[PDB]
């Protein structure tokens, strides 16, 4: 596909925000949820799953660009 | 079918935008939704389904052209 | 029925446009809707239903000609 | 009733046009409407109802002739 | 009443035309309207009502003769 | 009530058509709807309700004659 | 009130037709509507309401005579 | 009831299409839905219910003919 | 039933696609789901159920043809 | 069945991804889960079951192709 | 209240039909629903509730007469 | 207020009919609706609400007379 | 304002009829409507609103006299 | 109550069908469900409950007749 | 009860399929489940319970016929 | 509060029916539910809770009168 | 409380049925459940609890009458 | 605010009826609902919530007067 | 703005009635609605929202005067 | 209690089946379980407990009749 056009700026902002401030805010919310739900039932596997989801988010732009040429 | 005509330009723009900037914006929205809904209930299967839907989108033009000759 | 007459050209244009540029535009809109509504609730069954509807559209001329002789 | 008279030609043209070019144009419009309204809410039952209405149209001449002798 | 007189021929022509060519033309117009209005909102009940009205038309002469002796 | 009169033929045709060709067409439409809506949500209770409604239709003439003497 | 007079015959015909051929035709139309609208949404309560309305029609003459002495 | 009349052809086409091409298309859609919904939650009971509904469809003509004489 | 008609091509495409590319895609999705849900709770019985459902899909055309003659 | 068609590319990508990068990611997640759940309750049988599931995944394409011709 | 009047016959028919043929039909429908919904989830408590509702129906006339003098 | 006047007879008839034949007919319709809607979803609370509404109807004359002196 | 004059008698009759026979007839109609609409959807809140409206009607003369001196 | 009337035939058919072909079909569906749900979790108590429900169905006519005189 | 009627063929097919191919498929699924769940926890009592359930299935037709005359 | 007024009779009937026939019917339904749900899972604590709820019902009038003066 | 009224017959039937045929049926179901669940895990304490629950049922009328005066 | 005026009587009646006969009727309905919904699922917490709501109702006049001076 | 003028008296009356008798009547209606809708679904949050709305009403004059100088 | 009524036949069948064929089947299942569980851990006390439970079953009718008069 083409990264430019009328919607090039919107796509660019979304791609940078995936690993930018909004993505970091979502990751921090994930860490907060993992810590909070571990008060009654301590489960560190959710931390591993959250780290995997951050890894997926960091590669979201590459995945989208590879699927949508 | 015929790709040209009075509506040839509209169809061409839609076909390029399917894998272009609007399609990439929709894919980024999918990734954002997957990350956000994983804050409380981490589910990486939704990431696989989203990747499958991006794969479907990348082949949307071929599917439409094959069905509608 | 008879394919010719005073309205033969209008019917011919409609039949070609069913699988032509307007039909392809409608199919692309279907794919866009499937991708967009899958952002919050990923549902790939709607993709199958859309493909079935494109298959119905590709056979619309034959169906109309068979019903209306 | 009698198929001939001063209005025999008008009735003949209407009867042939029911399954002719105008009837086929209306059927194609039905298919276009079914495809278009299925973009947001895919509903293939409307396709079945449209096919039933084409079947009714194909038998319109027989029905009218049977009711009006 | 009496079927003959100065207006016997006019009444005779009207009675035959009720189920004749003009009545059949009106019935065909009813079928065309049912098909056309079903493009956007498919409603096969209007077909049943139209068939009932053709049935009423086929019995119009008997009804008029029974009411007006 | 009286089954004859100016409207005796219309009532007779309606009574025979209740269990005749139009009634059978409506019953077949009921079966088609039951089969179609069972694609996504299989529900065989609707088949029982449809059979009950066909049973009601088969007794419609008797019910109308008993209520309207 | 008085059942006779200049309009005695019209009132008599209306009273007999309430439970006669026209009333039976209206009841058959009610049954047809109940069957038809039950194709997509099977609802047998409408059958009960229709039977109640036929019961009201069968007692229409008595009600009118009691209210209008 | 009577299988013939003005609507004899429509009823005949509906009866053959119940077990014909449209009925087979609906059955194939049922199988596709059963396979698709079994991706996340494998449930082979829905296959049995679908087979029962195909069995009901195969006997739809007999049921309608028995109920509506 | 009859495999041909106005909807013969749609039924043919559906029957081939049941064991064709779309059916294989659904089967691959089943395998992916079995593998993914086995990360936390390894259950190889779901693999057996998925294989049984693929076996059912491979025989879907025969089942539909036997039920709907 | 046929490996080609409008959905040939999607099926091809799914088949390669079953033993490709996504399949390897799922297998690595299986190994991570086996290691993590063995911290408190060391169970090496889950490792054997995970290896069996990887063996099933490696043969998923052959199984799907054999079941769906 | 008074059981007679212009609406005495309608009320009488309704009161007898509460425990008559229509009431028995509704009770049989209740039993059919209890049996059908017990295929997947056998629940005999619904049978007890249905029997209680039949008991309420059998006393409906007395309740209505006591409340409405 | 005053119970007499030009509209004294109409008000008297309405007051007696509230607990008379029309009120009893409405109560019987309430019982029929409660029984019918309990076929699929047995709910005896609606019976209690209906009994409360009959109790309200039995006291309607007193309430109206107290509010409107 | 002044209660007397050329229109003093009309205003007096209207004021007495607000809580007199016509007002009571309207209140009875309100109760009948509440009972009737509660057959299918039992809603006793409408009874409370109707009682409030009767309370408003009982104070209509005082309100009108206070606003219009 | 009375077994005859306008709805006598419908009630008769329902009563015979309770223990007739439809009742036997529902019982066979119960047995099929008991066998199917016993594949993973063998529970023969559901067979006893199903037999009890068939016993209830066999006595449904007597129960309805006793409750509704 | 009566084995014939409009639903005689459906009941006949269900009765033969109880001990026919679908019943044998369910029994084979039972044996597969018994073998599979015995990999980790060998329990041959489940085999006895499965054999008892096959014995119940073989007598399902007799039980249903005895309960529902 | 005041026990009298336009709604004094309705409140009186409700207060007596709380410990009267309807309250006793609800208590008997509670006992029936306790007995029925104890067939599979015998739990006599529900009997104690039901007795406590009957005790609450017996004191409902006093509680309502104390709260609402 | 009062044992009579509009709901006196319903309460009477419920009270007799508590220790009558339905109560005995529930007790027999309790004994059947005790015997069945004792096949794998023989527990005669459940028999004692069931006997206690039958004793509670036999005194249900007295308990309800004492609590609800 | 001011308690008097054109609407002083309506407000006075509403304030007394909040803790008067209508308020007591609503409280009795609350108790009836608590008792009825406790037949299947005994929950005495709803009784506490209902008592709290009666306490709120008893203080409704004071709350309204304090908020609206 | 200016509080005086031709419409000064109307505005003054509206401002006093906001917290006067009509405002108190509306607040009492709010409390009645909260109590009534809590019969089936007890929800004390609606009481808090109603109290907040009374607080808003008490400050309506100040808000309007501040916005409209 | 009373052994007769609407549920007299169901209770009679249950009472005879307690010591009839179903009771004997349950007893045989008890003996089979005792024999099977004695393969690894021979325990003849379970045989004594099973015999005691058969003795309880043989007296179930007398116990139920004595408790429920
Ligand atoms: C150029 C490409 C080929 C055409 C593709 C599209 C064809 C249009 C059908 C899809 C639109 C569906 C959604 C519409 C959205 C919509 O709301 O439409 C509104 C518009 C008005 O229809 P009705 O009068 O049914 O509507 C009443 C209200 O709904 C008004 O909104 O519908 C139509 O005009 C479409 C039906 C025309 C179909 C009949 C055409 C054949 C008749 C003429 C034959 C020639 C006469 C020659 C005389 C010389
Ligand atoms: C030929 C086969 C036998 C007829 C089968 C079908 C009968 C039609 C009933 C089913 C249609 C239901 C769904 C309709 C769908 C629908 O929307 O219909 C619309 C149409 C208009 O009805 P309304 O005026 O109630 O509608 C107002 C709006 O709803 C307009 O849409 O309804 C009718 O005409 C049906 C009622 C006729 C029933 C009364 C017939 C008896 C009166 C005439 C007696 C003879 C007079 C003789 C004078 C000489
Ligand atoms: C191209 C490949 C071959 C097609 C493969 C897939 C076929 C689709 C079935 C699987 C989808 C299941 C999951 C869907 C997910 C889903 O939620 O679907 C929603 C959509 C709407 O169905 P309903 O109206 O039952 O849904 C009501 C609500 O559930 C809306 O969500 O379902 C369908 O359209 C599928 C049924 C079509 C099956 C009937 C088709 C035959 C009728 C047309 C025959 C031709 C008419 C010709 C007229 C000219
Ligand atoms: C790019 C890498 C290759 C893809 C790898 C992953 C494939 C996805 C399967 C694993 C996900 C399993 C766990 C999901 C977690 C999950 O909860 O999923 C939820 C989502 C919704 O499924 P249902 O509608 O069954 O769910 C209803 C509720 O459960 C909603 O949560 O499931 C799917 O969409 C997966 C099934 C798609 C499988 C069918 C795909 C083939 C149909 C489309 C064929 C093409 C149509 C073309 C039209 C033009
Ligand atoms: C950053 C370090 C490298 C990652 C290390 C850890 C990887 C995580 C595995 C260990 C966690 C095990 C204990 C978890 C504790 C736990 O309870 O987890 C719960 C969570 C939800 O899983 P299920 O849906 O099976 O759970 C249903 C219920 O159990 C919910 O609790 O499990 C997972 O998400 C782990 C499986 C992901 C494994 C599949 C990953 C590959 C799919 C995505 C591939 C990319 C898609 C790209 C799309 C663009
Ligand atoms: C032919 C064989 C004998 C019939 C056997 C089956 C009878 C049907 C009962 C079992 C279905 C249960 C599962 C349904 C599945 C289901 O969801 O049904 C939906 C359908 C609609 O019912 P509701 O309006 O309660 O439903 C509202 C929503 O739930 C819509 O889904 O239910 C009924 O129609 C069944 C109740 C009819 C029972 C009353 C019949 C007596 C009234 C008519 C008497 C004659 C009137 C004559 C007028 C002239
Ligand atoms: C004979 C038995 C005793 C009567 C029992 C029933 C009374 C009717 C109330 C229940 C019907 C409710 C459901 C209706 C269904 C319905 O849709 O009705 C429609 C009809 C029209 O009312 P609206 O003009 O409010 O309706 C506008 C649109 O909704 C049209 O549909 O409503 C009325 O006429 C009922 C109100 C009359 C109530 C006022 C009567 C007192 C005024 C006359 C006093 C005497 C004047 C004497 C002048 C000389
Ligand atoms: C072709 C082979 C012979 C059929 C074998 C299998 C029969 C099916 C029973 C086993 C499935 C059990 C596991 C299902 C898994 C499951 O979840 O099913 C879901 C589906 C929906 O049932 P419900 O409405 O009880 O479900 C509500 C929710 O649970 C939805 O999931 O259940 C049925 O349809 C089965 C009951 C049909 C049994 C009644 C059939 C007789 C009624 C029709 C008689 C003819 C009417 C003719 C009208 C013209
Ligand atoms: C290809 C090789 C041959 C197949 C070998 C394996 C067969 C599967 C049995 C072993 C799995 C046992 C462990 C499963 C692990 C497991 O948890 O399974 C879960 C899955 C769902 O079963 P239920 O609905 O009982 O489960 C409810 C919950 O337990 C969900 O987990 O069980 C089945 O689907 C197996 C039963 C199918 C057996 C009936 C098959 C016959 C019905 C279809 C006949 C054809 C219909 C045709 C319609 C056109
Ligand atoms: C004929 C023999 C004597 C009756 C014996 C059995 C009585 C029924 C109680 C046992 C069933 C328990 C297991 C049910 C299984 C079950 O799930 O039931 C479901 C059904 C619905 O109750 P809910 O609305 O609490 O349920 C909401 C959801 O749980 C729906 O499932 O429960 C009832 O109807 C039983 C409560 C009625 C008890 C109150 C009756 C008194 C009110 C009527 C008084 C007369 C009003 C007259 C108006 C004119
Ligand atoms: C005759 C025996 C004494 C009555 C005993 C039973 C009383 C009813 C309470 C128990 C039913 C609970 C389960 C219901 C099951 C149920 O779903 O009910 C549905 C029905 C509708 O209530 P809602 O509007 O809250 O429901 C909205 C949706 O839930 C609709 O389903 O609820 C009521 O009508 C009960 C509340 C009435 C309580 C307020 C009565 C006082 C207001 C009237 C005062 C007199 C006005 C006089 C004006 C002139
Ligand atoms: C008549 C003899 C004197 C009563 C003796 C027995 C008292 C009951 C306590 C023992 C039962 C324990 C085993 C139960 C077995 C059991 O499973 O119970 C289930 C039932 C439901 O409780 P939960 O909501 O905690 O249960 C949630 C799930 O566990 C449902 O099973 O528990 C209760 O209702 C008992 C608690 C009531 C205790 C609070 C009562 C005081 C509140 C009401 C005060 C009056 C309000 C008046 C409003 C107007
Ligand atoms: C009269 C004796 C003193 C009261 C004692 C009991 C107080 C109630 C608390 C215990 C019940 C706990 C178990 C309940 C069982 C239960 O399931 O309750 C259900 C009910 C609904 O609560 P939710 O909306 O959280 O529930 C949503 C779903 O769970 C519905 O079931 O809970 C409440 O209403 C209790 C919370 C009220 C607590 C807040 C009260 C303060 C707000 C009002 C302040 C005044 C407003 C004035 C406006 C003018």
């Amino acid at each position: 596909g083409s990264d430019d056009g009328a919607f090039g700026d919107i796509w660019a902002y979304m791609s940078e925000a995936l690993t930018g401030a909004p993505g970091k805010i979502i990751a921090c919310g994930m860490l907060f949820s993992v810590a909070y739900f571990g008060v009654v039932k301590p489960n560190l596997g959710l931390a591993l799953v959250s780290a995997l989801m951050m890894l997926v988010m960091a590669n979201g732009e590459k995945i989208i660009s590879s699927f949508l040429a």
Side-chain angles (χ1 to χ4, degrees), chain A residues 1-3 11 60-69:
Chain A
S2 68
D3 289 12
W11 155 241
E61 208 263 6
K62 171 198 217 226
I63 285 157
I64 292 158
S65 286
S66 77
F67 276 125
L68 309 177

Side-chain angles (χ1 to χ4, degrees), chain A residues 11-63:
Chain A
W11 155 241
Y13 191 98
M14 291 215 88
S15 49
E16 321 286 0
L18 199 41
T19 51
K24 280 182 228 246
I25 289 155
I26 298 181
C28 200
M30 291 165 128
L31 280 198
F32 262 107
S33 166
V34 160
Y36 162 74
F37 283 117
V39 164
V40 181
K41 190 190 118 43
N43 184 227
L44 274 148
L46 284 187
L48 284 165
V49 180
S50 292
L52 179 53
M53 210 155 337
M54 315 177 182
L55 176 63
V56 168
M57 260 196 297
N59 293 275
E61 208 263 6
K62 171 198 217 226
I63 285 157

